């Protein structure tokens, strides 16, 4: 690895995702190849998230990718902010189609016409559906793998309820699931809050989000969204049901939508990566422990059989293990090779170590070498793997606890912002006031989220940073990624 | 209920079954359809089986971009010219025309193999075995059918690259056998293995092996999956070269394969095993093998014990890994739940009446035969298990017999069209020419019979010196002919 993280971060990120065999560059700008090393992280998120949403009653399905030109113009506010971001298919071959067809930037306009046919009574509720698919967002910003891409994989769960109470209860349920994915699988602490009126989902009531922080660039990034659509989309697609007790009364449905993309892997690379390469948390690592024979220079057949000893012993306790037993490369090459890929534990077996009933476990995060007896293999490695997961989170929590501050004035909010930090400021919550913030912070700082539990309680009567309107709440501000 | 009959109008019967079973919902755009969770669970059941089998062969999962460039598609010329009229093109961002239209993938050959060239440099960089589960757009202007003939479908596509051609030719038949296991062991659908003719083969590749199924209701056959050996025709155009391990400087081209399996599997399952009373699911891919339905609806205290007895059955059937659901919904009638789960094709319906609860009795109803057999509260773990395996074999026996009745052999063009108009598929001696294959489709329609596959094990060996049905060229093999979807 030639680039450093504190110096050239952009070139460091490109070398890390490629040398770790996670990302391969295509030739259409905005598209990237998810190699099996990075795809195994996405499946680990799928098998965890799917097991949680199916407890809540959500069922997986799949909807068409194509949207007709008439279906996109059904919800006016939904097509406003999405019009410049949508890609249209106008012909197949050299034959122009009947009507231009769009690729889905989101499946709200595709499913809700079907929700209207399925919802006809109170018994046909609640509907809870989810799908793992791909979407196209034709944005004119600089693409970066995982983080910002035109095409990306995600999940989108759409749920219609008969009451606003049960709909509001699922919004916070899904948002806390997204928090578990970042904190308990990726070891990334995030801040849960609400979006402002300018950066909320178009055509919806309110948007909840989780904001992760990257100390290498001093920028924050949104990791997931969970919107409460209210009756906005159900009033335009005629998603109504009959009241169970009152005869003849028909009430509109209350709908929610929530999503989580593959930038979860990107934030993991940005938060835990170092100048030695990738760093995978043991919870999502494709290979947790790699076994490498050392000191090879004819008693070698026993050393290989002893590496196969640790390999099968770790498989029975259900620990993802890989045995690199290639004779083409030196043990020093394998050390560099698997450190770039982020394998949490390196299991070194030497000739004298084998005959001594001991081995060496090297931690990817700290580089510490711990000699472990042969009998304690399954139990000590299970303890170090759990310790690496927490260590990556505590160190990430320390960088988030110290880079998030409070500022009540504009110049002190401006000063701390240029020091690579995100700030919570008393904010009035107006669009015309937020545009001025991004105009004077310059690249300019945008709103991140209105945190549920802010760092400090807002003083009653305290004004906003603009000095003209009274402040409504503390809003986390900063530059986005 | 069901407003159509399978023998009367199969087209309307197909629309009623796929929708009333809550599998397919129609989309605003023709040719595109919605995969509801009941149909998606059938595809997920195929996924967990086929994924674990290719994992044992060294294949790893990944995901490639859905957009292909105009330069990469025009590399292999024979491949693009055959796919060109069905390639959806992205030509607009918002209300602005792009300076260079990009295409949506109808297959990921021209997308992955450029990356295969960068990865393959040494001999140890082989073999590369990569698979991906994704959707594919093939915007054909022909008559669309749900599952069977859709413009967008979910599928899997594995792309392998080997150093020697022996391992490549070996894996083609390995994947082809896995496709047969998906249809025979799981879907209980008998398939015939064979190679595709030069007309129906994969353009730009070497040879194409495929599986074929028969639908007795329409008398038409259908392709269930393909496994193409690409040879070096693709590695030569994308420069996928590896240095020779012994000969210094000399670089060799890699032998490649490609295989795909689509969601058409579900449509073939519904077309073959579906009856006039709804869907019929094989117990292997059954999302719900047995359904507990509390029937008999007075005594609310005993009625609570009836729901309690339902949970005991659902709790005991889980210990034997029998997929069970207890429909304890107090907002639906038991008669509603009967035909509702019958339309979904649940293999067994476990009904429990109040008199049966107070007498060590319960009734199990088979979906394939409709046998209402009363079983005691003792063999609930063994009898239902014996029925589930008896349902799987019975469905496969009816379909394997239907194939033997309608797959015959004819040696003259006269006997060809006669048995073809009887709703059967026929194995004929064929010369293998593209022009002769086009003449067969035109003559047998005056609706045209197409070549299905060249069976590896035909019904009869070609007699030495046999002539084709055309009479102008010697026959090379027996080919399965018949009308197709
Ligand atoms: C901003 C930009 C710049 C250049 C090109 C394209 C794009 C657009 N693409 C995205 O915003 C993006 N890309 C990958 C993964 N997640 C994403 N959204 C993030 C996202 C979207 C929806 C729900 C939840 C989340 C976390
Ligand atoms: C023929 C037609 C008519 C009208 C509109 C569109 C289409 C095209 N549709 C397909 O080719 C299709 N559709 C769904 C499932 N499998 C498919 N191919 C079948 C298939 C392809 C590749 C590998 C394996 C299989 C079994
Ligand atoms: O696009 C979005 O942001 C929401 C969440 C997933 C579905 N729609
Ligand atoms: O499209 C096809 O038919 C082949 C098989 C999967 C990849 N390409
Ligand atoms: Sr009213
Ligand atoms: Sr009302
Ligand atoms: Sr492999
Ligand atoms: Sr040469
Ligand atoms: Sr050569
Ligand atoms: Sr001749
Ligand atoms: Zn203000
Ligand atoms: Zn001929």
Curated annotation (Swiss-Prot), chain B:
Family named by the database record: In the N-terminal section; belongs to the class-I aminoacyl-tRNA synthetase family. Glutamate--tRNA ligase type 2 subfamily.
UniProt modified residues of type Phosphoserine: 333
Keywords for this protein: Acetylation, Aminoacyl-tRNA synthetase, ATP-binding, Cytoplasm, Disease variant, Leukodystrophy, Ligase, Membrane, Metal-binding, Methylation, Multifunctional enzyme, Neurodegeneration, Nucleotide-binding, Phosphoprotein, Protein biosynthesis, Repeat, RNA-binding, Translation regulation, Zinc
Chain's role: Multifunctional protein which primarily functions within the aminoacyl-tRNA synthetase multienzyme complex, also known as multisynthetase complex. Within the complex it catalyzes the attachment of both L-glutamate and L-proline to their cognate tRNAs in a two-step reaction where the amino acid is first activated by ATP to form a covalent intermediate with AMP. Subsequently, the activated amino acid is transferred to the acceptor end of the cognate tRNA to form L-glutamyl-tRNA(Glu) and L-prolyl-tRNA(Pro).
Residues annotated to bind Zn(2+): 431, 436, 468, 470
Disease: Leukodystrophy, hypomyelinating, 15: An autosomal recessive disorder characterized by hypomyelinating leukodystrophy with thinning of the corpus callosum. Clinical features include motor and cognitive impairment appearing in the first or second decade of life, dystonia, ataxia, spasticity, and dysphagia. Most patients develop severe optic atrophy, and some have hearing loss.
Localisation: Cytoplasm, Cytosol; Membrane
Residues engaged in binding L-proline: 107-109, 138, 228
GO cellular component, one term: plasma membrane
Residues binding ATP: 138, 140, 149-150, 223, 226, 262, 264
Region (Proline--tRNA ligase): 1-485
Modified residues (N6-acetyllysine): 476
Keyword Iron-sulfur: no
Domain notes: The WHEP-TRS domains are involved in RNA binding.
Statement: the UniProt record of this protein carries the keyword Plastid: no
Shown stretch of the complete protein: 1015 to 1512 of 1512
UniProt-listed GO biological process terms: cellular response to insulin stimulus; cellular response to type II interferon; glutamyl-tRNA aminoacylation; negative regulation of translation; prolyl-tRNA aminoacylation; regulation of long-chain fatty acid import into cell; tRNA aminoacylation for protein translation
Protein's name according to its UniProt entry: Bifunctional glutamate/proline--tRNA ligase
Cystines in this chain: none
Residues with PTM Omega-N-methylarginine: 138
Subunit and partners: Homodimer. Part of the aminoacyl-tRNA synthetase multienzyme complex, also know as multisynthetase complex (MSC), that is composed of the tRNA ligases for Arg (RARS1), Asp (DARS1), Gln (QARS1), Ile (IARS1), Leu (LARS1), Lys (KARS1), Met (MARS1) the bifunctional ligase for Glu and Pro (EPRS1) and the auxiliary subunits AIMP1/p43, AIMP2/p38 and EEF1E1/p18. Forms a linear complex that contains MARS1, EEF1E1, EPRS1 and AIMP2 that is at the core of the multisubunit complex. Interacts with TARS3. Interacts with DUS2L. Component of the GAIT complex which is composed of EPRS1, RPL13A and GAPDH.
Primary gene name: EPRS1
């Amino acid at each position: 690895l030639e680039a450093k993280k504190e110096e050239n971060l952009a070139d460091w990120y490109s070398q890390v995702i490629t040398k770790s065999e996670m990302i391969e560059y295509h030739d259409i700008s905005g598209c990237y190849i998810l190699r099996p090393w990075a795809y195994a992280i996405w499946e680990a998120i799928k098998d965890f998230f799917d097991a949680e949403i199916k407890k809540l009653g959500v069922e997986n399905c799949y909807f068409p990718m194509f949207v007709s030109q008439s279906a996109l113009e059904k919800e006016k506010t939904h097509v406003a902010d999405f019009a410049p971001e949508v890609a249209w298919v106008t012909r197949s071959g050299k034959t122009e189609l009947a009507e231009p067809i769009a690729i889905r930037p989101t499946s709200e306009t595709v499913m809700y016409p079907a929700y209207a046919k399925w919802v006809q009574s109170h018994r046909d509720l609640p509907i809870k559906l989810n799908q793992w698919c791909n979407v196209v967002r034709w944005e004119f910003k600089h693409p970066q793998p995982f983080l910002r891409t035109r095409e990306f994989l995600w999940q989108e769960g759409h749920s219609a309820f008969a009451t606003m109470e049960e709909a509001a209860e699922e919004v916070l349920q899904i948002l806390d699931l997204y928090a578990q994915v970042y904190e308990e699988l990726l070891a990334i602490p995030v801040v849960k809050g609400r979006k402002t009126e300018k950066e909320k989902f178009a055509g919806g009531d309110y948007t909840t989000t989780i904001e992760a922080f990257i100390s290498a660039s001093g920028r924050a990034i949104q990791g997931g969204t969970s919107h409460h659509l209210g009756q906005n989309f159900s009033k335009m697609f005629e998603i109504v049901f009959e009241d169970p007790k009152i005869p003849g009364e028909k009430q509109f449905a209350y709908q929610n939508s929530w999503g989580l993309t593959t930038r979860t892997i990107g934030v993991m690379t940005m938060v835990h990566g170092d100048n030695m390469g990738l760093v995978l948390p043991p919870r999502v690592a494709c290979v947790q422990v790699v076994i490498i024979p050392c000191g090879i220079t004819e008693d070698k057949e026993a050393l290989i059989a002893k590496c196969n000893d640790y390999r099968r012993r770790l498989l029975s306790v259900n620990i993802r293990v890989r045995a690199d037993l290639r004779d083409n490369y030196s043990p020093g090459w394998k050390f560099n090779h698997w450190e770039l890929k982020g394998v949490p534990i390196r299991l070194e077996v030497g000739p004298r170590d084998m005959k001594s009933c001991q081995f060496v476990a090297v931690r990817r995060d700290t580089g510490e070498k711990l000699t472990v007896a042969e009998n304690e293999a399954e139990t000590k490695l299970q303890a170090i793997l759990e310790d690496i997961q927490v260590t990556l989170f505590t160190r990430a929590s320390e960088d988030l606890k110290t880079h998030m501050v409070v500022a009540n004035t504009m110049e002190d909010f401006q000063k701390i912002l240029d020091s690579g930090k995100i700030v919570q400021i008393p904010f009035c919550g107006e669009i015309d006031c937020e545009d001025w913030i991004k105009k004077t912070t310059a690249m300019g700082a945008k709103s991140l989220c209105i945190p549920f539990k802010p760092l400090c309680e807002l003083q009653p009567g305290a004004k906003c940073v603009c000095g003209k309107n009274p402040a409504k709440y503390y809003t986390l501000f900063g530059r986005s990624y």
